[PDB]
Amino acid sequence: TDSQVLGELGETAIKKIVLETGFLYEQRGRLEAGTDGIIELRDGAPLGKLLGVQVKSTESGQYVRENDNSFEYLLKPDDLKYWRTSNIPVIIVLWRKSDETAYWKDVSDCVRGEERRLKFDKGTDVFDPRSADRIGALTIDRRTPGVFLPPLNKGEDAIINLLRIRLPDEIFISTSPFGSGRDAVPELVKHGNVRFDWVIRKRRFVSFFDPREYGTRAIVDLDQVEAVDTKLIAFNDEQDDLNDTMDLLRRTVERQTATQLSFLRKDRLFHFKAVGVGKSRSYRYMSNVNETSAKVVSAYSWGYVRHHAARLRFERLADEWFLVIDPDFHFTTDGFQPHRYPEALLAGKKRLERNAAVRGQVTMWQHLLVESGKHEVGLFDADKPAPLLQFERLPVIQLSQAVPESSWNRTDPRAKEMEAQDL
Amino acid sequence: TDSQVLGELGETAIKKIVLETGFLYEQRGTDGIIELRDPKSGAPLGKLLGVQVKSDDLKYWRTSNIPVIIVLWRKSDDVSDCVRDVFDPRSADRIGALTIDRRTPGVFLPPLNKGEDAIINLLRIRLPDEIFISTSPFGSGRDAVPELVKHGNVRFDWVIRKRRFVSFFDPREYGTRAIVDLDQVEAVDTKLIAFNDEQDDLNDTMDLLRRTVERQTATQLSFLRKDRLFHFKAVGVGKSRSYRYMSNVNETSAKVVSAYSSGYVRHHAARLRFERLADEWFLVIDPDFHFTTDGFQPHRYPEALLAGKKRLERNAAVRGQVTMWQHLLVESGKHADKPAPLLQFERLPVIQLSQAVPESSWNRTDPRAKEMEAQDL
Amino acid sequence: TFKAHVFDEPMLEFGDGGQHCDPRQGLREHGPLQPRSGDVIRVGVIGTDDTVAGFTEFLAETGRGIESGNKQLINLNPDFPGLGNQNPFRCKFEVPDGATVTISRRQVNDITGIGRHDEAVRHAVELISSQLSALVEGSAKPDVIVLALPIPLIEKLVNAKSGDMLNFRDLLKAKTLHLPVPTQIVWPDTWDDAAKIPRKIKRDVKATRAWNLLNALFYKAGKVPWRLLPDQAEYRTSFLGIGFYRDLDGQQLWTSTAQMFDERGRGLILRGARAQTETRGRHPYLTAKDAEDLVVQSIAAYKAHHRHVPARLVVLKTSRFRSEEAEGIDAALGKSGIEMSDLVWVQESSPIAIFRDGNYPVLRGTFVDLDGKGLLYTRGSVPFYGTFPGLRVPRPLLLVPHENSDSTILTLAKDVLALTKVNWNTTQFDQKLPAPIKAAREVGRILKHVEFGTAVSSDFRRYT
Amino acid sequence: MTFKAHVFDEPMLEFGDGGQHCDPRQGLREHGPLQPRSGDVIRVGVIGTDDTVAGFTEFLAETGRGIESGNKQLINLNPDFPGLGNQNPFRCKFEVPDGATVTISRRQVNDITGIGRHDEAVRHAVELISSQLSALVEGSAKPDVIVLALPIPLIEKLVNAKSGDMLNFRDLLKAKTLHLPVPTQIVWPDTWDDAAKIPRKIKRQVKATRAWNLLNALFYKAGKVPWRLLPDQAEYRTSFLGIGFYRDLDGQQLWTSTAQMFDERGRGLILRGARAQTETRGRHPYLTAKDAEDLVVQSIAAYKAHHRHVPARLVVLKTSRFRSEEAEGIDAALGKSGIEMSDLVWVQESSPIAIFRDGNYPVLRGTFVDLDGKGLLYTRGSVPFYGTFPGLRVPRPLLLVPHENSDSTILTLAKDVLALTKVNWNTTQFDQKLPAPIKAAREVGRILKHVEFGTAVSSDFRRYT
């Protein structure tokens, strides 16, 4: 916006004089025809005293009064302080781009009203580095009870777990002579050309692939093998069909991610498999357009092998299926045998539950799931069928207000603890 | 036996008579059964006839609907009726006519009297004469595992349930000194906990014996919480391993880890339960199998492999498995500055049965005899 | 220590005092325990036109006599001598006119055409339960009804193998429990029992099967081929099993049942109070008061259908007798006036076992005393059968008598062993569990479709 | 579909004489409690050893003189206590009157800590403490609240440690004294924070905030109101009714329903309903349409008997989904009641859906995502007032699913849930995860499982804290 650029130029100028004086400058949010921020005293150290500043920027146009010696400006109630909640004192600095000069007065009274008439004198008050003693004097300490640190009005974005699922338009449904899938697994392993991405509940067989063509012929009644719209099974209100839909979504995810993942019935946990006994291994994915690496299997040596894991859950939102990524870990003694006493290792996972590390795990897990459904030549079509489910990322969730992070790594003593230190 | 010898002499003479005509004699004070043979075939006709050789105390063939004949002999030289003419071989043609008509409904094939032995899957546990106990700030063992692993010299053969510690080793000399309240530790008679009627002490004793046997056999065995199943561990991936043990007075070996290629891996396993009968504790050995994808990774679908297990549940195959597991268990607790096994095991005396299964005759007569033996596909 | 006895194959009394161990060989010489001249069994039939004619033909062939399948094991697979002069049951099996109801082709296609299994089972039961009630209230007056469903209808109603879903047979038995005539559901090709166990997808013993269907028909009709030969003729002994079954509806609570048997093999089924549980709804048990009322309700039920008061009453369970349970039972026994009383815990899943030299398992009837506990082998090598009938090795039963018991564990082990010959399924006498325990599993499968507080018949014939 | 987002303001509170502020501690410092009367005193009874009683009086006197902060860099999170004098935040004198003290001899402590069986020592400790509690309440002291300052050796004996199989001392004590009208606060005798509610660490410095929480609990347990939630319309008033289940340990382990009604002043009412049904194998508890009607009718009659104002909107809350029968009975009771507006909300504490910003600090408290018909509310996270994230682990958000029978929007309801998390009887920290009805359900259910079903239980929530 034209207004944002002018406000950026204004605060940049004001930041220069402020730093020239010896104080500090940070920005909070964005006004109309200007931007705002905070200024902190320094002696070589931030001293914990802070002042607000309102940087109004105009490119041309004289102020109200005769500009020979003085001037007048009016403060709109809406452009008035958003710091009304906070108890810090604030100044206002009027900077004209064409004259390249500013003047500061005290606007500590900001409650909305017709207090708009502001009386400025060019001689008495100018924002020069020379006004430093005055600016510093008008200061309430951060260490006073009641000082709000108001959140950033800048705005920021964030990602969500969900991966949109693109189901095949048709689902094969058929009756089964067997009761449950587990009852039919014995007969299936005998014939050959066997896949396990199918569900048999209450004598009903469902799968996206044709049962007649991939050796599931024995576990189904071929007579009533028939195709049907996927919305008739997935997008209904029948709890039995929602349960069968979620079971078929899991078993298909297992097949498509079988190259890099193994499924554990205990806690329904997917984890990165191991390739060598007591041997670490890494995974290369894509975070946005950046090439990354993650030690998904870390072997430690008195022996524990940690595996990157995640609970893959399925949630339906407004006639649209999504996959939830919930990252955790899976510990093994030798890369395969589960740890005989996994209770001692659970504490280390809590130190690894910080925002940046979970965001990276979700971003990684999305890349594996998205690639599993991709139609390309780089699949193992030799001896293995092609993926039928595809997964789509979601737009970034846009937040109106942002976390004052850059300000908090200075002020907040416990900021480093927000970082995830491994072992 | 003074009388055993007296009869066998009679049996031997008459037996040589009958084989000279092709008939058969089988041991069943001697009782025997005669089966005729077709000359060219050299095979049993099926025609039977009971012979008692002697040289209210009636025959035990009384239930049997078999024709019974008695033979009279002396050291120097038809009785089908049961109440309260020579053996010169011409007689044989005549005696043959009194067949039982073979498999006529009502034949009894009665059990042998001599008796036979049998082993039991029990092993007497010899417990340390004392057991240490204490209170703990922790509710159960799973609460105390995080604190215990922060210190050295860790062991897991102890139990904590409802804030009460028990162990056969002294907790003050290991990392367990951090999970126990130190002023309340005291050794007492082991019978105070293991030989009472309180179900909680009965439970805590079974968990202690389970956790001690696990530690004692960590070299050869691994413990799996699912089904509380011990199994022979593996070395390498998909690589079979054999275990060498003593059966009777002989040496033998067993493929405790098995593999089959086109995969999966078998593991000799056992459910090791505990059963106190009369103020003595016993370890029960229930043989089973555990399957893995490649030695260490568990199998994804046990159901396809459970079908082949019940082809291997045959008496001889399972008996030889208990014989092995007892050797591993008794040998585990054997043999100035390092600890030693806390638990020892003792084989029980063989069980004596007053009657025996006529397996020799049944292998010939029963057309299902071969199915009784475990074929390892 | 651990002395071992090998028991005798318990004796059965047949007609005119005849005794034998095999149910068939005993009925082959003496006939049933009490024979009445001109006895006849009115057998009703439901099925398609093809199945009904198939049943009539099997009945005719069965009457003509059927030859043995395997001559080498004649004791295990005997000839059926056929209705006539050698007929063992000494009773006429007839299908009189008008005693036949036929399911139309439409109706069969309508049941198979329903996709939802629970919806299809409820529809078929609804159909046949109104065909059974229509035949009982009719003038045909049948004694036992044979349900001969066609194969395509059975495969829709019975799952297969190599409570989340309705079981057809269990729901049918519950809906027809108030009906007085028992029902026999059979396969139309082999004529063995159907819908009790899951079928085989590649399903592909004629005389033995005929012996069994006729035996079932006889027991259902209300007659007794044989009684357990008692140790003393004056001594009367009854055997009471106590079980529990969990409802799948409501608060998923447990309900206590009783399986009361006599020396002749006649069961009296009763429902007791809601059970209590030790932890999280598992581990069912009864309070001292509820235990007393059930046993009183069971003794009163037995004494109604019999002439003599039993001198001894044995109480069997599959779980340990809680002291609250044992106190109430002994209280009801002391008030009942019964002379002797024995309480036995029959463990089905004890890992203890003995192994002999050779491939053949230990003899059935092998008993090993374990200092008050008894390891009994109900199933094993049978001398009469000349082999071991099963393939997997048998797992014995650990018998633990209560302190309040009056008999030794040697006498009690004989009783349990003999009680495994009461057999409403087959004519084979080497059953693993005694009759009260087998009856407990069946009634639990059926009464869980019957609402609590609803009156239930005490006639075991309706449950089989 | 891509979803929408909103960041809620920290829901405002009203203090004395119309004062408004978001933090309970500052609002009490700037305006005092809501409706103070001249000369308020909270007569505080004490039970413990001679040392613990003297230590409590010292901490109370220290509290009156004031305790400066212990972390000046996070002053709004670690404030100083201004003292119980002129700047008395509660405008209420805290005194221990003569005779309200009961002492436990050094022998009696050794008598409990000497019993080898945990369950036996728990019961013996309750029988001891409950009998002394009965002596105070039925005496001349007439206390308004009682403080239980147990010695360190006794607390370490009755409370488990960490890093239904056995009894918990606090829950058994609450159940055995649920008939006495004087609440009880249990405190460690060193730091004077709450004890026996959560397990202790294996091995035992904030001081002013420890004092803030203790006085706030005593103020609430005495029966006074520090503040109330400020409504969007002053005249329309909303009441909040949670519904929970607690499973019994003995008998048949049957579930039992409870209702935790709260008004806008933070005052609660605890009602016990009929035995619940289960979907599968004794789990997944639910209520039939008739019994759900009785529970709501009983709660509204309890509301009407105490609060003496007409509730305009009634928001019903549950942690399990509203089954068809449950919603039908709630509608029948609500319609017969005359409540103009009604809302049903299924609060999912354990949803795996979450959003992650780019940084180390988590998202702001008040962040809300409108997944179509399903709200993702972040009751924990970064707090601008506190200037940090008052935790360590990543906050896991609440997922709010309004029922089709609801009147208000999902936005109107998430703004309601965020407000219900400010109500706190534990601390003076306002970033609590769960709303007041849900937080009470975990708590009363733990206590009522030791009061036999059928016995009438008190509705005053103060006896449950």
What is the 8-class DSSP label of residue B121? Answer: S
What is d(CA D354, CA C95) in angstroms, rounded to the nearest whole number? 72
Look at chain A and count its residues: 423
Q: Does A178 touch chain C (CB under 8 A)?
A: yes
- Residue A219's nearest CA partner among A199, A234, A239, A238 is A199
Per-residue tokens: B27: 């041991």
What is d(CA B275, CA C352) in angstroms, rounded to the nearest whole number? 9
Non-local CB neighbours of C299 within 8 Å, separated by 6+ positions: C313, C332, C336, C338
Domain termination residue (choose one: A135, A155, A175): A155
B106 and B119 belong to one structural domain: no
Could you write out the DSSP letters of every residue in B231-272? EE--SSSS--EEEEEEETTEEEEEEEEEEE---EEEEEEEEE
Angstroms from D161 CA to nearest CA on chain B:
5
Domain membership of residue A370 as a residue range: 163-399
Non-local CB neighbours of B345 within 8 Å, separated by 6+ positions: B123, B124, B125, B126, B283, B326, B329, B330, B332, B333
Q: Are A13 and A37 contacting, i.e. CB atoms less than 8 angstroms apart?
A: no
Q: Are C236 and C263 contacting, i.e. CB atoms less than 8 angstroms apart?
A: yes
CA B316 to centroid of chain Cα atoms: 8
What is d(CA C32, CA C15) in angstroms, rounded to the nearest whole number? 5
Domain count for chain A, please give it: 2
Phi, psi angle pair for A217, to nearest 5°: -60, -40
Within 10 angstroms of residue D342's Cβ, the number of other Cβ atoms is: 21
End-to-end CA distance of chain D: 44
Asked whether residue A132 is assigned to any structural domain, the reply reads: yes
CA B22 to centroid of chain Cα atoms: 39
Residue labelled with tokens 């991405």: A197
Chain-chain contact of D252 with C250 (C-beta, under 8 angstroms): no
Helix-helix angle C117-136:C105-112, to 10 degrees: 150
CA A287 to centroid of chain Cα atoms: 12
Q: Are D145 and D97 contacting, i.e. CB atoms less than 8 angstroms apart?
A: no
b/e burial code for range A143-178 (CB count within 10 A of at least 16 → b) = eebbbbbbbbbbebebbbbbbbbebeeebbbbbbbb
- Residue B230's nearest CA partner among B273, B187, B185 is B273
Q: Are D371 and D343 contacting, i.e. CB atoms less than 8 angstroms apart?
A: no
Q: Which amino acid is at B135?
A: T
Find the helix or strand (DSSP H, E) in which A328 lies.
strand A321-332
- CB-facing half-sphere around the CA of C101: CA atoms within 13 A: 20
Q: Which CATH class is domain C228-463?
A: alpha beta
Within 10 angstroms of residue C73's Cβ, the number of other Cβ atoms is: 19
Grouping H, G, I as helix, E, B as strand and the rest as coil, residue A69 is coil
- Residue C373's nearest CA partner among C353, C354, C399, C407 is C399
Per-residue tokens: B19: 């084989």
Find the helix or strand (DSSP H, E) in which D31 lies.
helix D24-31
Angstroms from A63 CA to nearest CA on chain D:
36
Chain-chain contact of A203 with C161 (C-beta, under 8 angstroms): no
- Residue C417's nearest CA partner among C395, C400, C434 is C434
Instruction: Locate breaks in chain C with C to N over 2.5 A; list the residue preceding each.
Output: 162, 204
What is d(CA A95, CA B325) in angstroms, rounded to the nearest whole number? 91
Phi, psi angle pair for A152, to nearest 5°: -65, 135
What is d(CA B80, CA D176) in angstroms, rounded to the nearest whole number? 85
> Vertex D115, ends D110 and D117: CA angle to 5°?
150
CATH 3.40.50.2300 corresponds to the domain D36-222: yes
Q: Are D369 and D376 contacting, i.e. CB atoms less than 8 angstroms apart?
A: yes
Q: Which amino acid is at C407?
A: S
- Residue C223's nearest CA partner among C264, C162, C183, C180 is C264
What is d(CA A206, CA A195) in angstroms, rounded to the nearest whole number? 13
- Residue C114's nearest CA partner among C127, C101, C100 is C127
**Chain B residue with the nearest C-alpha to that of D162:** B143
Non-local CB neighbours of C218 within 8 Å, separated by 6+ positions: C32, C41, C89, C91, C225
- Give A177's contacts in chain C (Cβ within 8 Å): 155, 159-160, 201
CA C49 to centroid of chain Cα atoms: 30
CATH 3.40.50.1980 corresponds to the domain D227-463: no
Find the helix or strand (DSSP H, E) in which A252 lies.
helix A239-256
What is d(CA D271, CA D296) in angstroms, rounded to the nearest whole number? 9
Grouping H, G, I as helix, E, B as strand and the rest as coil, residue D201 is strand
Within 10 angstroms of residue C394's Cβ, the number of other Cβ atoms is: 22
Strands (E), B136-279: 158-160, 164-167, 186-189, 221-224, 229-232, 241-247, 250-260, 264-274
What is d(CA D28, CA D92) in angstroms, rounded to the nearest whole number? 12
Chain-chain contact of C75 with B106 (C-beta, under 8 angstroms): yes
Q: Are C393 and C361 contacting, i.e. CB atoms less than 8 angstroms apart?
A: yes
What is d(CA D70, CA D79) in angstroms, rounded to the nearest whole number? 8
What is d(CA B234, CA B295) in angstroms, rounded to the nearest whole number? 6
Chain-chain contact of A399 with D364 (C-beta, under 8 angstroms): yes
CATH number of C35-221: 3.40.50
Within 10 angstroms of residue B40's Cβ, the number of other Cβ atoms is: 5
Non-local CB neighbours of A83 within 8 Å, separated by 6+ positions: A52, A90, A110, A148, A150
B45 and B117 belong to one structural domain: no
B261 and B327 belong to one structural domain: yes
Is the alpha carbon torsion for C322, C324, C330, C332 positive or negative? Answer: negative
A109 and A167 belong to one structural domain: no
Please list the residues that pair with D345 across neighbouring strands. D317, D402
Please list the residues that pair with D187 across neighbouring strands. D149, D194
- Kindly state the greatest CA–CA separation across chain A: 99
Q: Are D395 and D378 contacting, i.e. CB atoms less than 8 angstroms apart?
A: yes
CB-based burial label for A44 (10 Å; 0-12, 13-18, 19+): exposed
A126 and A215 belong to one structural domain: no
**Chain B residue with the nearest C-alpha to that of D158:** B137
User: Left, alpha or beta for D196 (phi > 0: left; psi -120 to 50: alpha)?
Assistant: left
Rg (CA), chain A: 31
What is the 8-class DSSP label of residue D460? Answer: B
Asked whether residue A144 is assigned to any structural domain, the reply reads: yes
Q: Where are the domains of chain C?
A: 35-221, 228-463
- CB-facing half-sphere around the CA of A224: CA atoms within 13 A: 18
Chain-chain contact of C357 with B307 (C-beta, under 8 angstroms): no
Phi, psi angle pair for C263, to nearest 5°: -65, -15
Q: How far is CA B276 from CA A390, B201, C326, C370, C371, in A?
A: 59, 13, 22, 10, 10
> Vertex C164, ends C158 and C166: CA angle to 5°?
40
* Chain A, chain D: beta-carbon pairs less than 8 Å apart: 139
Q: How far is CA A24 from CA A31, A51, A94, A231, A234, in A?
A: 20, 10, 19, 60, 58
Non-local CB neighbours of A378 within 8 Å, separated by 6+ positions: none
- Give C65's contacts in chain B (Cβ within 8 Å): none
Non-local CB neighbours of B86 within 8 Å, separated by 6+ positions: none
Please list the residues that pair with B24 across neighbouring strands. B35
Is the alpha carbon torsion for C74, C80, C84, C89 positive or negative? Answer: positive
- Give A394's contacts in chain D (Cβ within 8 Å): 2
Chain-chain contact of C159 with A177 (C-beta, under 8 angstroms): yes
Find the helix or strand (DSSP H, E) in which A166 lies.
strand A163-166
Is the alpha carbon torsion for D339, D341, D342, D347 positive or negative? Answer: negative
A76 and A213 belong to one structural domain: no
B267 and B310 belong to one structural domain: yes
Angstroms from B149 CA to nearest CA on chain D:
11
What is d(CA B316, CA C361) in angstroms, rounded to the nearest whole number? 9
Asked whether residue B278 is assigned to any structural domain, the reply reads: yes
Within 10 angstroms of residue C25's Cβ, the number of other Cβ atoms is: 21
What is d(CA D7, CA D3) in angstroms, rounded to the nearest whole number? 14
Q: Are A305 and A274 contacting, i.e. CB atoms less than 8 angstroms apart?
A: yes
What is d(CA D191, CA D159) in angstroms, rounded to the nearest whole number? 17
CB-based burial label for B364 (10 Å; 0-12, 13-18, 19+): middle
Angstroms from A214 CA to nearest CA on chain C:
19
Within 10 angstroms of residue C412's Cβ, the number of other Cβ atoms is: 21
Task: Give CA torsion, residues C195, C197, C199, C205, to 10 deg.
Answer: -90
- Give B120's contacts in chain C (Cβ within 8 Å): 2, 352-355, 368
Angstroms from C311 CA to nearest CA on chain A:
48
Asked whether residue B368 is assigned to any structural domain, the reply reads: yes
Helix-helix angle C206-221:C49-64, to 10 degrees: 100
A211 and A322 belong to one structural domain: yes
B234 and B357 belong to one structural domain: yes
Q: Are C186 and C192 contacting, i.e. CB atoms less than 8 angstroms apart?
A: yes
What is d(CA A94, CA D160) in angstroms, rounded to the nearest whole number? 64
What is d(CA B327, CA B243) in angstroms, rounded to the nearest whole number? 11
Q: Does B307 touch chain A (CB under 8 A)?
A: yes
Strands (E), chain B: 24-27, 30-38, 43-54, 68-72, 116-120, 122-126, 130-135, 158-160, 164-167, 186-189, 221-224, 229-232, 241-247, 250-260, 264-274, 281-294, 297-298, 344-347, 351-353
Chain-chain contact of B314 with C359 (C-beta, under 8 angstroms): yes
A346 and A274 belong to one structural domain: yes
Angstroms from B374 CA to nearest CA on chain C:
9
Non-local CB neighbours of C240 within 8 Å, separated by 6+ positions: C258, C259, C260, C261, C295, C298, C313, C314, C315, C316, C436
> Technique behind this structure?
X-ray
What is d(CA C184, CA C220) in angstroms, rounded to the nearest whole number? 9
- Give C276's contacts in chain D (Cβ within 8 Å): 251-252
Q: Does B373 touch chain C (CB under 8 A)?
A: yes
User: Left, alpha or beta for C87 (phi > 0: left; psi -120 to 50: alpha)?
Assistant: beta
b/e burial code for range C186-224 (CB count within 10 A of at least 16 → b) = bbbeebbbbbeebbebeeeebbbbbbbbbbbbbbbbebe
What is d(CA C314, CA C343) in angstroms, rounded to the nearest whole number? 6
Look at chain B and count its residues: 377
Chain-chain contact of C280 with D278 (C-beta, under 8 angstroms): no
Chain-chain contact of B145 with A344 (C-beta, under 8 angstroms): yes
Task: Give CA torsion, residues B181, B185, B191, B192, to 10 deg.
Answer: -60
B11 and B119 belong to one structural domain: no
- Residue D46's nearest CA partner among D189, D177, D223, D169 is D189
CA D185 to centroid of chain Cα atoms: 13
Please list the residues that pair with A312 across neighbouring strands. A325
Chain-chain contact of A202 with C155 (C-beta, under 8 angstroms): no
Kindly give the pairing relationship between strand C237-246 and strand D101-103.
unpaired
Please list the residues that pair with B48 across neighbouring strands. B35
What is d(CA A278, CA A306) in angstroms, rounded to the nearest whole number? 10
Q: How far is CA A408 from CA A352, A358, D326, D361, in A?
A: 21, 21, 47, 9
**Chain B residue with the nearest C-alpha to that of A196:** B301
Q: Are B188 and B130 contacting, i.e. CB atoms less than 8 angstroms apart?
A: yes
Per-residue tokens: A286: 């894509």
Angstroms from B297 CA to nearest CA on chain A:
5
A130 and A223 belong to one structural domain: no
In SS3 terms, chain C reads as: CCCEEECCCCCEECHHHCEECCHHHHHHHCCCCCCCCCCEEEEEEEECHHHHHHHHHHHHHHHHCECCCCHHHCCCCCCECCCCCCCCCCCEEECCCCCEEECCHHHHHHHHCCCCHHHHHHHHHHHHHHHHHHHHCCCCCCCEEEEECCHHHHHHHCCEECCCCCCHHHHHHHHCCCCCCCEEEECCCCCCECCCCCEECCCCCHHHHHHHHHHHHHHHHCCCCCEECCCCCCCCEEEEEEEEEECCCCCCCEEEEEEEECCCCCEEEEEEEECEEEECCEEEECCHHHHHHHHHHHHHHHHHCCCCCCCEEEEEECCCCCHHHHHHHHHHHHHHCCCEEEEEEEECCCCCCEEECCCCCCECCEEEECCCCEEECCCCEECCCCECCCCCCCCCEEEEECCCCCCCHHHHHHHHHHHCCCCCCCCCCCCCCCHHHHHHHHHHHHHCCCCCCCCCCCCHHHHC
Resolution in Å equals 3.0
What is d(CA C198, CA C180) in angstroms, rounded to the nearest whole number? 27
